[PDB]
Amino acid sequence: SGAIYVGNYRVVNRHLATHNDWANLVWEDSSRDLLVSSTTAQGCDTIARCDCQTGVYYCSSRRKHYPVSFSKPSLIFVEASEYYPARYQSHLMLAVGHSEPGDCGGILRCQHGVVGIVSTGGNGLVGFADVRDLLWLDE
């Protein structure tokens, strides 16, 4: 679990969005596993606007942060799960690192701010949904 809180927006994994997220929907994209909802309170986070390919992520299943080298956002095949059919997930960045069910929503940060959130895992890999291209989150 986990979310990004920026301005009057909450960014969560689309497959973990709540009834309240859907009632206050701003934007969602099944191919990216992202959903953004509106909030009444001002958020605690800053979004990176950069091309970093190194950063640190929080892994809830280890209660630890880990440094990672990750690929640029791209279209990657993801196996069918209870949440989605087998499909290509877009804007996804992969890295070598631990990730298991429950780690979705952990934040990946670089020196410039929030880069994205955990969205996929298994086999000693961790995949992050990028948010750096969503410039409207800043306004």
Among 45, 70, 119, 130, binds ligand A1BOO (CB under 6 A): 119
Closest Cα partner for 114 from 21, 6, 27? 6
Annotation says 19 is catalytic: no
Annotation says 15 is catalytic: yes
Query: Which positions from 34 to 63 touch ligand A1BOO by CB under 6 A, shown as an x/- string?
Result: ------------------------------
Query: Which positions from 64 to 93 touch ligand A1BOO by CB under 6 A, shown as an x/- string?
Result: --------------xx-x-xx----x----
Sort 9 into a burial class: Cβ within 10 Å, 0-12 / 13-18 / 19+: buried
Among 44, 101, 135, 139, binds ligand A1BOO (CB under 6 A): 101
* Long-range interactions of 75-80: CB distance < 8 A, separation 24+: 76/120, 76/127, 78/120, 78/127
**Residue 120 within binding range of ligand A1BOO, rule CB under 6 A:** yes
Integer Cα distance of 40 and 96 in angstroms? 37
b/e burial code for range 25-64 (CB count within 10 A of at least 16 → b): ebebeeebbbbbbebeeebebebbeeeeeebebbbbeeee
Catalytic position from the list 21, 33, 103, 130: 33
Among 50, 75, 96, 125, binds Zn ion (CB under 5 A): 50
Q: Which residues sit in the known binding site for Zn(2+)? A: 50, 52, 110, 112
**Residues belonging to the active site:** 15, 33, 104
